[PDB]
């Protein structure tokens, strides 16, 4: 196995007190895909200033992320005391095709100390620590997140210039406040800047040793280290896993300023990751010497279709999340960032089915539900639709009434009633776009505004929120063509808007640019 060096000498662990309520903050950071936020650059290829479609793992455009903040622990007077940390050790997540993170975003600004927030200390970048593995479970004290067999460990040591990676078995310790002891609270790691991080000799074992104080390193199959340098700039990092092993990505090695991720490193581990957690960390800084740290964010990767706007230098500068909006769908369908003005049909709303209705004499509450849009099963015949009580048509005894295209028109039930079956009402959608003002509006067809609402139970794709920035302040408007949003009854008479809606209606622009 790997030469881990010495085991920890001290038996007892420094006590960890959970101060999680101090860390409740709301500094959300939605992905800006038009700035290429979170974009992982394509593997093994480059391009010129051409725009292409691409398929790969990406963050959702609407994702605000999960936010975590590291802080200094307890100290008083001129000395360190007990650790005062967030409850992040309990935050076990289901791994889901990798994730990406944003680091140091609030650098070159000020924040608060959090645990003693009234100080209003300036904030600086701090690097995250992580644990990944195939299985989790309870600690001996019932605490969440004990990892089993071998686990991945990612920790910076001391100052941000050194990163270490491990694949090893963790061993619980029987000391005071330690994982096999009965005084255990929560695992955490720490850095002690008063003696660590010396300017002529940064403590390259600092955080690993504080890690070792809670978990012994046994059976270690992989260890790697990486060289980093200090910089206040925002950084991107990510993790994915394939049959080739874990892949590590970063912006730092290649694209420090644009922020596109590149294939920084890979790992030999072929064990599939099922679970992921963040290792909580704290600083053992002296009470007067406290320094606040910039917020840290995590976003999940997803198998999505995107436009990518490559620069003349091969860098991705803009991107479009194709499924995010109806407007985004049009940009992807024409492969462009500058679609011509017009009225365009887009994907329709489905309906969204309710609870199932089942009849099958041979389990007891919903044998009927007269009129909605439900899934059903009728003696092994299945489908979905709206039932309505109506006048008898076909020969009862044979039950199922069909049309010439073999669709179930109706049903004679075991209550003696004939029910008409009309499937469900999908709602067609089109959007009005003007390129010159870069504004838009929508039309729902002849369905009528009685069935339209500010949020929808019916579902197609993601959201219509780009319209709703103005259109959630208005009612739907009934017109002769259809129900619309954002259209305003001006009652003007205009010869030609170049955006006719049919009949005699016309979608006039707000006064041109």
Q: How far apart are CA 40 and CA 31, in angstroms?
A: 13
Binding of residue 256 to a copy of itself (CB under 8 A):
no
User: 350-380 b/e with 16+ CB inside 10 Å = b?
Assistant: ebeebeebbbeeeeeeeeeeeeebbebebee
How many Cβ atoms are within 10 Å of 172's Cβ, its own excluded? Answer: 17
For the chain, the residue count is 513
User: 196-217 b/e with 16+ CB inside 10 Å = b?
Assistant: bbeeeeebbbbbbbbbbbbbbb
- Span interacting with a copy of itself, options 27-35, 63-71, 136-144, 400-408, rule CB under 8 A: 400-408
Binding of residue 404 to a copy of itself (CB under 8 A):
yes
Among 139, 224, 226, 400, binds a copy of itself (CB under 8 A): 400
Nearer to a copy of itself, 30 or 42 (CB): 42
Confirm if 437 and 513 have CB atoms less than 8 A apart.
Answer: yes
Nearer to a copy of itself, 343 or 408 (CB): 408
Q: How far apart are CA 78 and CA 201, in angstroms?
A: 23
Nearer to a copy of itself, 42 or 445 (CB): 42
Least Å distance, CB 48 to a copy of itself, is 6
Nearer to a copy of itself, 148 or 402 (CB): 402
468 three-class SS: helix
Site pattern 26..45 for a copy of itself (x: CB under 8 A): ---------------x--xx
- Span interacting with a copy of itself, options 125-133, 341-349, 350-358, 389-397, rule CB under 8 A: 389-397
Binding of residue 257 to a copy of itself (CB under 8 A):
no
Strand bridging mode 354-359 / 342-349: unpaired
Least Å distance, CB 62 to a copy of itself, is 29
Binding of residue 262 to a copy of itself (CB under 8 A):
yes
Nearer to a copy of itself, 312 or 361 (CB): 312
Nearer to a copy of itself, 243 or 312 (CB): 312
Among 50, 243, 492, 494, binds a copy of itself (CB under 8 A): 50
Nearer to a copy of itself, 19 or 260 (CB): 260
User: With CB under 8 A, what is the number of residues at the site for a copy of itself?
Assistant: 26
Q: How far apart are CA 140 and CA 341, in angstroms?
A: 65
Binding of residue 502 to a copy of itself (CB under 8 A):
no
Q: Within positions 298 to 327, which residues make up the interface with a copy of itself, using CB under 8 A?
A: 312-315
492 three-class SS: coil
Q: How far apart are CA 107 and CA 105, in angstroms?
A: 6
Q: Is the sign of the CA dihedral 366, 372, 377, 379 positive or negative? A: positive
Q: How far apart are CA 153 and CA 132, in angstroms?
A: 7
Least Å distance, CB 250 to a copy of itself, is 13
Which run of H or of E encompasses 155? strand 150-156
Binding of residue 393 to a copy of itself (CB under 8 A):
yes
Angle, alpha carbons 365-370-372 (nearest 5°): 105
Tokens representing 29?
């950071």
- Span interacting with a copy of itself, options 113-121, 132-140, 190-198, 395-403, rule CB under 8 A: 395-403
Least Å distance, CB 472 to a copy of itself, is 39
Site pattern 408..447 for a copy of itself (x: CB under 8 A): -x--------------------------------------
Q: Which residues face 478 on adjacent strands?
A: 483
Which run of H or of E encompasses 329? helix 326-333
Nearer to a copy of itself, 394 or 509 (CB): 394
Q: Within positions 179 to 208, which residues make up the interface with a copy of itself, using CB under 8 A?
A: none
Among 67, 223, 254, 481, binds a copy of itself (CB under 8 A): 254
Q: Of 128, 70, 133, which Cα lies nearest the Cα of 100?
A: 128
Binding of residue 110 to a copy of itself (CB under 8 A):
no
Tokens representing 7?
């085991």
Among 4, 29, 30, 47, binds a copy of itself (CB under 8 A): 47
Instruction: Give the distance, in angstroms, between the CA of residue 338 and the centroid of all CA atoms in the same chain.
Output: 28
Binding of residue 394 to a copy of itself (CB under 8 A):
yes
Binding of residue 54 to a copy of itself (CB under 8 A):
no
Binding of residue 52 to a copy of itself (CB under 8 A):
yes
Alpha helices in 149-216 (DSSP H): 206-212
Nearer to a copy of itself, 296 or 376 (CB): 376
Strand residue runs (E) in 196-288: 215-227, 235-242, 245-250, 262-266, 275-279, 281-283
Binding of residue 96 to a copy of itself (CB under 8 A):
no
Binding of residue 397 to a copy of itself (CB under 8 A):
yes
- Span interacting with a copy of itself, options 28-36, 192-200, 344-352, 393-401, rule CB under 8 A: 393-401
Among 85, 374, 401, 485, binds a copy of itself (CB under 8 A): 401
Confirm if 152 and 132 have CB atoms less than 8 A apart.
Answer: yes
Q: How far apart are CA 223 and CA 212, in angstroms?
A: 15
Nearer to a copy of itself, 308 or 484 (CB): 308
DSSP code at position 313: T
> Which residues sit at the interface with a copy of itself, rule CB under 8 A?
41, 44-48, 50, 52, 254, 262, 312-315, 393-395, 397-404, 409
């Amino acid at each position: 196995y790997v030469d881990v060096g010495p085991d920890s000498v001290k038996s007892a662990c420094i006590e960890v007190d959970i101060q999680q309520t101090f860390f409740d903050k709301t500094w959300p950071r939605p992905i800006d895909v038009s700035k290429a936020d979170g974009i992982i650059y394509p593997q093994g290829r480059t391009y010129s200033n051409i725009t292409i479609t691409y398929q790969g793992l990406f963050p959702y455009q609407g994702d605000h992320g999960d936010m975590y903040v590291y802080s200094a622990g307890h100290a008083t007077g001129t000395t360190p005391q007990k650790l005062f940390v967030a409850n992040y050790s309990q935050d076990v997540k289901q791994f889901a095709n990798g994730f990406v993170v944003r680091i140091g975003a609030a650098a070159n600004s000020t924040g608060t100390v959090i645990i003693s927030p009234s100080t209003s200390a300036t904030i600086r970048k701090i690097y995250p620590a992580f644990m990944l593995g195939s299985s989790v479970g309870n600690f001996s004290d019932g605490k969440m997140g004990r990892f089993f067999n071998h686990t991945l460990v990612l920790l910076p040591d001391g100052c941000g210039t050194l990163l270490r990676a491990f694949y090893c078995i963790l061993e619980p310790r029987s000391g005071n406040h330690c994982p096999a002891g009965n005084s255990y609270t929560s695992f955490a790691t720490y850095h002690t800047p008063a003696t660590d991080c010396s300017d002529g000799n940064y403590n390259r074992n600092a955080s690993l040793n504080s890690f070792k104080e809670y978990f012994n390193l046994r059976n270690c199959t992989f260890m790697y280290t990486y060289n980093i340098t200090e910089d206040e700039i925002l950084e991107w990092f990510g993790i994915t896993q394939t049959a080739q092993g874990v892949h590590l990505f970063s912006s730092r090695y290649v694209d420090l300023y644009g922020g596109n991720m590149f294939q920084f490193a890979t790992l030999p581990v072929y064990d599939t990751i099922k679970y992921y957690s963040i290792i909580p960390h704290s600083i053992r800084s002296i009470q007067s010497d406290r320094k606040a740290w910039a917020a840290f964010y995590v976003y999940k990767l997803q198998p999505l279709t995107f436009l990518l706007d490559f620069s003349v230098d091969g860098y991705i500068r803009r991107a479009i999340d194709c499924g995010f909006n109806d407007l985004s769908q049009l940009h992807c369908s024409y492969e462009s960032f500058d679609v011509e003005s017009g009225v365009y049909s887009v994907s329709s709303f489905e309906a969204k089915p309710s609870g199932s209705v089942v009849e099958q004499a041979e389990d007891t509450k919903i044998a009927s539900q007269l009129g909605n849009c439900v899934e059903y099963s009728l003696y092994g015949v299945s489908g979905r639709g709206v039932f309505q009580n109506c006048t008898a048509v076909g020969v009862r005894q044979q039950r199922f009434v069909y049309d010439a295209y073999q669709n179930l028109v109706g049903y004679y039930s075991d209550d003696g009633n004939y029910y008409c079956l009309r499937a469900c009402v999908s709602v067609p959608v089109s959007v009005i776009y003007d390129k010159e003002t870069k504004t838009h509006a929508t039309l729902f067809g002849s369905v009528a505004c009685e069935h339209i609402s500010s949020t929808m139970s019916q579902y197609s794709r993601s959201t219509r929120s780009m319209l709703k920035r103005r259109d959630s302040t208005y009612g739907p408007l009934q017109t002769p063509v259809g129900c619309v949003l954002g259209l305003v009854n001006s009652s003007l008479f205009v010869e030609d808007c170049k955006l006719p809606l049919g009949q005699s209606l016309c979608a006039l622009p707000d006064t041109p640019s």
